[PDB]
Amino acid sequence: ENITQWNLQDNGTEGIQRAMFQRGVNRSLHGIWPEKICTGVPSHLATDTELKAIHGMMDASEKTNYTCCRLQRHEWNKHGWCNWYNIEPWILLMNKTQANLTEGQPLRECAVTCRYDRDSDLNVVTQARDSPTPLTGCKKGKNFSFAGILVQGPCNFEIAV
Ligand SMILES: *[C@@H]1O[C@H](CO)[C@@H](O[C@@H]2O[C@H](CO)[C@@H](O[C@@H]3O[C@H](CO[C@@H]4O[C@H](CO)[C@@H](O)[C@H](O)[C@@H]4O)[C@@H](O)[C@H](O[C@H]4O[C@H](CO)[C@@H](O)[C@H](O)[C@@H]4O)[C@@H]3O)[C@H](O)[C@H]2NC(C)=O)[C@H](O)[C@H]1NC(C)=O
Numbered sequence: 001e002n003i004t005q006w007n008l009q010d011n012g013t014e015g016i017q018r019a020m021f022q023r024g025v026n027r028s029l030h031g032i033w034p035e036k037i038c039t040g041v042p043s044h045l046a047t048d049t050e051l052k053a054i055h056g057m058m059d060a061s062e063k064t065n066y067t068c069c070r071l072q073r074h075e076w077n078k079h080g081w082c083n084w085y086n087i088e089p090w091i092l093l094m095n096k097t098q099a100n101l102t103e104g105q106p107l108r109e110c111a112v113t114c115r116y117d118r119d120s121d122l123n124v125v126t127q128a129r130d131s132p133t134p135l136t137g138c139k140k141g142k143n144f145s146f147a148g149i150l151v152q153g154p155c156n157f158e159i160a161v
Pocket residue numbers: 002032034035083084085086088089090
């Protein structure tokens with residue numbers, strides 16, 4: 001029921017993706033999204049110390065030189081507090097999810113946002129998730145590149161029929 005989304009390195013994409021390519025990082029966690037989105041005053045103010053414990057997860061913000069902890073705090077505020085109640089279980093999950101992402105191509109990896117590269121003739125996956133979803137910026141008929149890994153379809157498993 002929870003969507004796990006992450007960023008993948010792409011020099012062709014200004015922002016987090018360019019920074020990941022430079023830093024030799026393949027997959028950086030974006031968030032874990034339950035059905036319920038949090039509204040109102042959070043239960044706990046996520047400190048940088050707490051948020052730095054999610055090892056390997058880069059910030060999508062230029063303001064922190066794509067390090068910590070803007071994206072991280074945003075995630076706890078919008079998706080974390082009202083669903084996990086405590087920061088400790090949330091931190092451990094986010095970190096274990098990022099640990100697994102650092103290992104390599106996940107069991108379930110589906111393109112979310114693409115950036116078609118005319119030179120290589122590939123759909124360079126900028127963001128991916130553990131469930132198939134309507135694509136964005138993807139050219140139909142072209143193969144996919146998930147941080148260097150070439151896949152025929154938008155997912156690393158069969159969806160259809
Ligand atoms: C997918 O997403 C859901 C959230 O959307 C995750 O579910 C949460 O999981 C965490 C644990 O990983 C749970 O946190 C613990 O909640 C306890 C309170 O729960 C009450 O019972 C039900 C659960 O059936 C809730 O729905 C109620 O609202 C209640 O409030 C809470 O006591 C507990 O704290 C205890 O443990 C921690 C660490 O061990 C201590 O720090 C703490 O002080 C205390 O002893 C945790 O906060 C949470 O209940 C879940 N919430 C819901 C709504 O289901 C899934 O596990 C995610 N799964 C995947 C696979 O991504």
